[model samples]
Target: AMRPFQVQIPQADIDDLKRRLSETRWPELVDVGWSRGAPLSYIKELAEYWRDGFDWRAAERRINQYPQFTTEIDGATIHFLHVRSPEPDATPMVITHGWPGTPVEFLDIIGPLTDPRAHGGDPADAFHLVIPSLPGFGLSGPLKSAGWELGRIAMAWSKLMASLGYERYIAQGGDIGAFTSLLLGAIDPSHLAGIHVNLLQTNLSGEPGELETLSDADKARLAVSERFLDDLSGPMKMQSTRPHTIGYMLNDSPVAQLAYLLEMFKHWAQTENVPEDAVDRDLMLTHISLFWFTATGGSAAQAHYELKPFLPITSLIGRSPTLDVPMGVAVYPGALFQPVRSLAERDFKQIVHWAELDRGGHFSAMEEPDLFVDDLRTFNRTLKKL
Candidate 1:
């Protein structure tokens, strides 16, 4: 029997969230358009939707449908949604969430991934989904100390898989999920069947002015990548610099929290014109509520500190062994890191499938599940034979 978690949020906490949202002090961004500091009109629209139409209970029930549990691992409480298919025997796959993201992103794909027949896929390809909130985020709470890098998280995930009795399985990720999945592949080389990632990081070749040789397409992709880093990757950079500064604001101000997070949605979302079109309102609120309730504001912001030292050089090659295992890379044009073939070859030796999609940004799972799932299927098809 699976352990039961409280499906309802305490009324007091709910009231507090409402009070904070009501008393929010809006920031002044004079003469800013939709492209600027998150268009005033759009933020107002989302705020209204959140206060009125966003149903936490609906999301809570959906989340509760899966058996949720918390385990003490590495001096922190790790929360995960363990959903097994009705099938007696199912292949287990661990799906990881990245920074500023929670297990909510997987809510759409979980059903299909776990019970493919229900969603019109082969039962043989069905997966028992193990989606965990990344350390320092959501139900996992915050890291006990600094230096919770990819390597440490990978080890924790390995332990998680073992705890669930999955001796061998595949790993998938987007955003920081990609990094964590890559780490898992490297650390648990024998157990990990393959690794799939969306968005690759930038590479500044060591040779003096080596960037000069980049092809026209590579140069164009590099430009697109930089634009994403500048606009979409703001929170990561800010958190990396002074987490405490941002933490204090998000901890105390609901409007501040919304603005800080919603800003990302404005730019990194699937379609800029229709921000909420790609992401469900309830899904967004669930993530915000988790951050606020857990008081993980500071800790969540500090994850950047873990990667600061490795910045500018934390390419795929940084992870030794070069991830010889079967790998899949999804190139969403607007993502911060768009890797060309030459750049990706440095780290991933076994490139089974590389996809360049027409749409979708950083959050491929949420932005374009059809494309994301197809890529996963293609990779699985290729790897299952190997």
Candidate 2:
């Protein structure tokens, strides 16, 4: 297996991370309640735990528990977790995470997916799991060079699945992962058995007649979706448009880096008590620390910079993705696109399972593991009969 790469992060790197977190320069806020910018109070609370309470060694050990390795693909080193299921005939599944997220996000679901019989699930539902760090993010990289769009990522993932010796498998993702998964199904349906998504994206165009039939729920979802596309997608757009603008900020200032990432943790997650309420404080900090220690501030920013060409309307969607494979979807209330039944049906086919949860937001794996695992188990069970 090419000498399974070491899992240890040197002590020097850990101490340097704490040092950087302590030395972070604070940003001044204009009191937008985090509506306009990241709240100073929230950032400070998260930073404290990050510098003190957060334990990187434990996370490092957990990260290393499973076999971790890297393979050179198209001149880029791709990092992934290849965990085989105890069930010899278990189905293979590739799980992808979106931006501002990492492979760690899928840790909770791995146990249930890989060893379902042990987790109150059917043996037929077990999965030989393949989780990848997207280009320009996490261990796979801060990316190198430009033009790493969805198509390229989709191709790479197909190669990734094949590398694990799988002729076919299910593909799942949210946010950018959703786009990548869809592309995988489209480009390589021969090897793509099915598709699943928690946060799927769709073309935002509308028919004049359809607007008149919109429901109140549809309107509400549209409002939330619009705000995200218009207001919140600014950072993403900048990353796509002028990546270097924000790259420079995150590159030099650790506090700026924290604020840049922490804001999403606040807004996107389904948290009401605190802006930092949705995700675990220690986990959040560890992720930020990884970025700093890896010095990936500029590299990670390039996904936005490089993915710009594919963002526009004409390029977003055209030929309907005739995904004849079994498709599964889990819709959370706090998701940016709260697509109604009709909206989703138009795009997917053979949808064996669909769920709308009361809690949980954009990051489903992190927000609700039980619900996510249950949905996956249900889908896997139904599809296995086919």
Candidate 3:
């Protein structure tokens, strides 16, 4: 049974975090900016702010204002927010958070999505939103078992929506969340009405013939995608192969966790210098703070280890994805990778909606909530006709 949950992180944990941030041992290095990793200067400043000025209690109070819950599913405790739209027939949606991100990422978009009428959008565009922390992230857990990969996580979502009395619902996500959503569309078509993913985790780099048919703009985006996949995927490699080995640093040093997350936050968004350029600074800290308080950074990497979820769509050029449900994609400019509609339509036969916005990035929902909400609403609007 699902139970009411609240955000009451122990005061002791908060004190310890502040203490660690203050005592961080600086690592000396030649300054090459983010060319190496998160700039030390930026990370240090954020760390100090997080330690001294950033208010956790205040943030906690705000987060607690939302309706949250926890339920044990398939041997794991799932933490989520279930916000029902006042609209009588609001489409039900389950949005999943990715690695290095927590449910905190959805704070900005949830209100507008769940209650569009309040946000000045048509009441018809409102939705009943189910936002969950991925199994091994934030309040969810570091996880207790070995098999919590994409498919397993997807199965749990199937059960989650069903248990909530939603016979039909839409699925949406990015990063690991996208992988999980895609798998749900593949395996649980009965419950999943359609899927709208912000991130396209497809890898077609091995198939050179795949690029020729795309538009020039598509080729440029694909080139950017290719370079990012080839060069910046080191963390994916390490996490997939050595999840346990990295846990000590991720779990122990507050600074290590901050730098580790900041690197991705900086590069994956529409930012040139810092993550602050793309998303809210305090919001970023809240996400990092959740990661630190939960200490799930390492175990979250285990999900990284399960590569079976990625194999089918990467090499098969002509074959349709296993997904039986319709698919929609919201491709943001600074996203780590871009999706080609031709490729997406090729792989997932039922590509219903595709939005290519010139703003935001991987965390577009957080970075550009209005654009994100509109794109999602646009996709949801299309699904209503079908």
Candidate 4:
């Protein structure tokens, strides 16, 4: 049953969040800056604002502007934003959000993609977007049971579109969503028109600097990737290994939850340093609030653990046997690592389009919606020609 849904976080929950934030006991240890993790100083500042400054009511109002619904897919209830394009022949598309993100991550891109005519784009490029909160994610809530890994999520997406009456539709995502979209192309090619992704999450251990001629930009990206491999993945280790333990810590304390997500938002962005510099503070908090309200910290972390085993170091997005459907790539400067075209083309059988944008980060749509939508529109155009 697909029932209509809206986010009306109980006032009691809001008050509790505020109370917890206000009463947070921060670490007095040290502020080693971004070198270690989200500094105590910065996290504390954000916590104060989240308590006294940020408005959850306003956030709710903004998100409620779109139509939302929930339906059971394989025993788990799925929450999603369903925005239909008014364009006569608007294409159907299912866009997924990454972990550390919610369905609201595409809040900005939804309007532009659904009603391109209104957003100053060709009506021909319009899409009817289905943005789902993956199981164990915000809105989707503490997952029903275990085994909600990457493959199961892809199958659920296939079921989602089929149930929605979409015979043919494209898929798009970033972060874990990026990996999910790729699997959708491989597993559901019969109905999936194509797949487009912002972040190409890869196992960068194979023949690193040996295979391809290096551009200066590529060299810088490789250096950044190395730094990511070395230092930036601490939280991931925790989430992938002991999500339950971390969940208990974060679920009880709002500050712990914010700090946990903030660290990722801080490093994965196209930032000069702080997270707010690249992404909107309210957007980040909106996601954080979802985690706090839903108390799905542990559930969300389980995806990391499930994905860890499949990554046997052979390299690639779980190295899906053959993703032969039309595929498009939009490279962002701020992502963890840049997509080496050679590495990408070697796996994606039908590489229809690729765009290396000037700016944006891991959460591309949230960080740079205009560029994200433009790339999607262009990718659709390329698909049409082919």
lDDT of 1 by residue, 90-193 (tens): 66778887767888777778887778888988887777888888778877777776667778888888988888888888888876777788888778888888
Which portions of model 2 miss their true places by more than 4 Å?
Answer: 1-3, 28-32, 309-319
How accurate locally is residue 263 in candidate 1, as Cα lDDT from 0 to 100?
Answer: 64
lDDT of 1 at 249: 72
List TM-score per model, in order: 0.91, 0.91, 0.94, 0.94
**Candidate 4 residue pairs that clash:** none
The whole-model C-alpha lDDT of candidate 4 against the native structure comes to 0.83
Task: Select the stronger candidate by TM-score from 1 and 4.
Answer: 4
Best by lDDT: 4
| Candidate 3 wrongly placed segments (more than 4 Å) | 201-212, 308-322
Q: List the residue pairs that clash in candidate 1.
A: none
Clashes of each: 0, 4, 0, 0
The digit string of per-residue lDDT tens for model 2 on 1-386 reads 33365456678876766777788767565876767666777777777777788777888878788887788777677778889999998889888887777887877889988998898877878899988777777687666666677899899888878877899898999877887888887788998878888985454345556556678877677556665776667778777766777767786666778888866777788878565567776667667766766667677777766666555421433335556778888888878767655666666767777877888888888878888888888887777777
lDDT of each: 0.74, 0.76, 0.82, 0.83
